[PDB]
């Protein structure tokens, strides 16, 4: 069902058949320092490091800096030959296709895709924003958001540091910000708008206050419009020129554009001095540790077999199938927290949602910021207990037998599972390394593996050529067409990273309808952060909606930017926008702590290479590092895995053994371990001058929303002793019924004399208690009078404590404050009858017991709401003992119901609004009469279904 798209092919420039071996570190500096290609590769990728090498060769480098210089150069050398991952001048990106025969050979021609370093560029514009503010115009940073008397940002920048900063919401912030909320406004008019309702006396302060917003990036200048998303030398230069009267910046900038254009046609090896010129003209303007990024594209076209295509599609299905066993994620627990705080009827402003003092904070696994109240880890279930026994069983036998682990064993388990549920997953990107074993070509799955973010691996390369833009457009038009069916507005999050070093990762082309920007601005239609509201589907699924247009939103980050790095709210918007189950493969999770893991394989694919964990503590005086790794039967060629990258080593090469001894002694310092992986021969598959290249590939594969905007706390919260008084009475479950018999009616009698009315509820969490809510006109006097009854229940050890709490009304659930109040009259009437029903259930002269009263009362409710019309009653029911009727309390309840029923008719409530509200009112009756119990509430409806049919 998964179809393998045309893929990206990534390969080295240099060829590993030309790799030289080495025995000494000085020998490596000697060779490398007259290797024309290497030094251009080094000067471009790692300027600072390249200069340290110069410094050493000149004798100017301090001794303590030398081991690091030696190791970094050796590792960078290995990499320019052995590591195909695409990065400027080491390796190149091309497009590959599926045909009838494999074509592992590159006829194409290599070209340099060249951007400015993005940290350099932004750091310049920020310098222009302060120097030239009086000649610029400004807009509001979408990152800003009001919160009480403060203005916050979803993240912070200028303090070149790591600390968050917020400002006061002043009258002057209000004027300035609302004035710039939708367009750009000239410095002078911003200043004018302030003085025009303060006085010209204040023009000093206005300018200062305005400048301080600009330093702290509460405002964005027009130099930043499209500056990170679609940069144009024309548009940029003409605004700088318009700004720069003393020609300080234009001309060097024109020279830089020239020198880069000249650099574009030079070969790889020959441009060292042209590059030196670029760095020189750019370092004069403003210094930065990097000045240029290059992505090398080719126009070659690698081909794969029809069998190969089938092998990959087979692998995609197996991997996607395992997500079938992900029953409860960290985000599911968050959905539950959501529903407990908000119910299902509210939509919540996203910045209110994630507030840990006023909302529910974040998913347990979010760290920006981590929750600042304590909470223990929730239950998750990413695989079953049966699955885990199989995996451990598979693990134990493979180690006992010196075998690999064939995941094939469970392929028929996972494809079989849940053939009923319609799989959510739209597609996959997979990352694969090409190698060989026993002269046969094999695929090896990257340790990154892949993801379900379609177009993520190609978005960076989209703009660099038309063929690439076409490619990317195809990949994401399978998502955009489906968004269009479902009437969902897609939306790219476009942002300056919080740590601006990472600013070159964020690049992609905007293929969506709208844009959500932060610390930048574009020309697209843009969503306001504080217009995003979160709710819950008919299927208890998180969705996002723009409160100004009522559009439903899905958000995208079509790049390889680490998603766990974001501010919680942005990470959340991203995560609710795809299908939350791909991610945690069971073998990764279950085998994680073993220090030897066999190779994992699946249908000739190497899912995961053999993996070791070597421990610092094990290198002993009776044991060096080389018989340690020999005591663990480490192959003669292996990788040491650092993080992002890995370093090739051989036991035969003594330099490789020095790097390892270095590695092992660093970890003996922290008292942890290093990670070794087995080596695959990977050099002579793809080729060029019939010389191999190291290669890898990236294959892609292919309602009636009600809900109401949440009501403010000012309107929903009822404060103690104003209109209501609300007590939590901490009474055990076994004694609540006794309290409801022998104490509550003395409390009801009291509040009656004072002309009021009360309703109660049973609630656990934290500990079990009864929520007593009294509405009455002299509440301090009613508190006084019932305090005697409560003391009596403390003495008899039925209640331990009480609190007086804020009554948070459920306005949205019960239909607005009008139908809410009528619901509350139903609550209080239901509460008057309960002690009498309990006394009938308790008396044995009766021989009616608790389940008889429950179906009966439930029967009378339905007879009230639908006015004895049995056919309507069964309408409601399909979709989910005479003296109580002549009881005076029940007559009062029956009026309370007629009155709610009338107002719902008056205000034209859609009918499912009425069905949900009657379900709620019957739900809290059951709470009151019997347990806080799940589903035994629901099976009452089933038997009432039977009794009503019989009336006919």
């Amino acid at each position: 069902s998964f179809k393998a798209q045309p893929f990206l092919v990534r390969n080295t420039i240099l060829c590993p058949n030309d790799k030289r071996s080495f025995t000494e570190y000085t020998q490596v500096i000697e060779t490398v320092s007259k290797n024309k290609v290497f030094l251009e590769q080094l000067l471009l990728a790692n300027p600072k490091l390249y200069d340290v090498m110069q410094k050493y060769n000149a004798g100017l480098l301090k001794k303590k800096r030398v081991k690091k210089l030696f190791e970094s150069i050796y590792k960078y050398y290995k990499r320019s030959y052995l590591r195909s991952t695409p990065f400027g001048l080491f390796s190149e990106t091309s497009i590959g296709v599926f045909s009838k025969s494999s074509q592992y050979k590159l006829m194409g021609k290599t070209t340099k895709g060249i951007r400015l370093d993005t940290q350099w560029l932004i750091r310049l514009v920020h310098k222009m924003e302060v120097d030239f503010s009086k000649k610029l115009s400004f807009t509001r940073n979408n990152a800003n958001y009001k919160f009480g008397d403060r203005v916050f940002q979803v993240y912070t920048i200028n303090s070149s540091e790591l600390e968050e900063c917020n400002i006061k919401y002043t009258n002057v912030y209000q004027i300035i910000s609302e004035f710039c909320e939708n367009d750009y406004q000239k410095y002078e008019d911003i200043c004018e708008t302030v003085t025009l309702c303060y006085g010209d006396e204040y023009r000093e302060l206005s300018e200062q206050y305005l400048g301080s917003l600009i330093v702290n990036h509460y405002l964005i200048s027009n130099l930043q419009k499209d500056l990170l998303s679609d940069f144009s030398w024309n548009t940029f230069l003409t605004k700088v020129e318009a700004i720069d009267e003393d020609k300080k910046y234009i001309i060097p900038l024109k020279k830089v554009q020239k020198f880069i254009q000249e650099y574009s046609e030079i070969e790889i090896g020959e441009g060292i001095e042209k590059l030196k010129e670029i760095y020189q003209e750019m370092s004069q303007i403003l210094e930065n540790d990097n000045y240029i990024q290059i992505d090398l594209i080719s126009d070659s076209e690698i081909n794969f077999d029809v069998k190969q295509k089938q092998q990959l599609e087979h692998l995609a299905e197996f991997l996607g199938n395992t997500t079938k066993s992900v029953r409860r994620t960290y985000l599911d627990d968050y959905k539950d927290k959501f529903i407990e705080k908000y119910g299902v009827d509210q939509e919540v402003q996203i910045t209110e949602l994630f507030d840990s003092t006023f909302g529910i904070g974040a998913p347990y696994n979010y760290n920006h910021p981590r929750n600042d109240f304590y909470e223990s880890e929730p239950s998750t279930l990413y695989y079953s207990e049966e699955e885990r026994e199989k995996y451990l069983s598979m693990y134990v036998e493979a180690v006992k037998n010196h075998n690999v682990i064939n995941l094939d064993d469970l392929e028929s388990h996972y494809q079989k599972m849940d053939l009923e549920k319609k799989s959510e997953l739209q597609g996959l990107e997979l990352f694969l390394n090409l190698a060989k074993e026993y002269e046969k070509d094999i695929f090896i799955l990257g340790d990154i593996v892949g993801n379900n973010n379609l177009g993520g691996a190609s978005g960076r390369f989209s703009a660099l050529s038309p063929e690439l833009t076409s490619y990317h457009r195809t990949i994401v038009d399978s998502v955009e067409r489906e968004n269009e069916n479902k009437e969902i507005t897609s939306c790219e999050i476009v942002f300056l990273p919080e740590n601006i070093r990472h600013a070159n990762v964020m690049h992609t082309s905007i293929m969506r309808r709208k844009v959500l920007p932060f610390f930048t601005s574009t020309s697209h239609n843009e969503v306001l952060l504080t217009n995003i509201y979160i709710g819950i589907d008919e299927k208890e699924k998180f969705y996002a909606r723009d409160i100004s247009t009522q559009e439903v939103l899905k958000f995208y980050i079509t790049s390889m930017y680490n998603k766990t790095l974001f501010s919680n709210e942005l990470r959340f918007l991203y995560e609710i926008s795809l299908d939350d189950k791909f991610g945690n493969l069971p073998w990764e999770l279950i085998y994680r702590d073993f220090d030897y893991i066999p190779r994992l394989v699946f249908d000739e694919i190497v899912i995961s290479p053999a993996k070791w964990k070597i421990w610092g503590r094990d290198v002993n005086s009776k044991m060096t590092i080389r018989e340690l790794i020999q005591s663990k039967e480490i192959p003669k060629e292996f990788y040491i895995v650092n993080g992002d990258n890995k370093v090739y080593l051989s036991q035969k090469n003594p330099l490789d053994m020095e790097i390892l001894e270095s590695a092992i002694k660093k970890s003996s310092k922290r008292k942890d371990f290093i990670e070794l992986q087995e080596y695959f021969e990977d050099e002579n598959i793809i080729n060029k001058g019939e010389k191999g290249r190291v290669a890898d590939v990236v294959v892609p594969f292919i309602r009636a929303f009600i809900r109401e905007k949440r009501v403010s706390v000012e309107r929903r919260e009822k404060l103690p002793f104003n209109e209501w008084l609300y007590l939590k009475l901490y009474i055990s479950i076994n004694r609540q019924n006794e309290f409801l018999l022998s104490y509550l009616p003395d409390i009801q009698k009291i509040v009656a004399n004072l002309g009021g009315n009360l309703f109660f509820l049973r609630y656990t969490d934290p500990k079990p208690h009864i929520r007593l809510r009294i509405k009455c006109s002299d509440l301090f006097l009613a508190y006084g009078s019932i305090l005697e009854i409560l003391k009596r229940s403390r003495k008899n050890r039925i209640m331990s404590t009480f609190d007086i709490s804020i009554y948070d009304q459920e306005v949205e659930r019960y239909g607005g404050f009008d139908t809410l109040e009528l619901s509350e009259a139903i609550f209080c009437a239901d509460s008057k009858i309960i002690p009498n029903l309990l006394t009938l259930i308790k008396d044995t002269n009766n021989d009616w017991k608790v389940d008889d009263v429950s179906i009966l009362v439930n029967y009378l409710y339905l007879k009230c709401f639908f006015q004895n019309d049995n056919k309507k009653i069964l309408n409601f029911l399909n979709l989910v003992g005479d003296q109580i009727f002549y009881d005076k309390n029940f007559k009062e309840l029956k009026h309370a119901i007629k009155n709610l029923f009338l107002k719902m008719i008056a205000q034209d409530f859609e009918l499912q609004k009425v069905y949900s509200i009657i379900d709620s009112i019957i739900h809290v009756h059951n709470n009151r009469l019997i347990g806080i119990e799940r589903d035994k509430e629901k099976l009452i409806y089933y038997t009432l279904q039977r009794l009503f049919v019989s009336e006919e």
Binding site: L162, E163, E164, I167, K168, V172, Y202, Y209
Partner: peptide, 16 residues
């Protein structure tokens, strides 16, 4: 008045 402040504040990252 002095609602031109700004009041920038920045933050980092018992009993018994």
């Amino acid at each position: 008045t002095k609602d031109f402040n700004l009041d920038l504040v920045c933050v980092s990252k018992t009993x018994i």
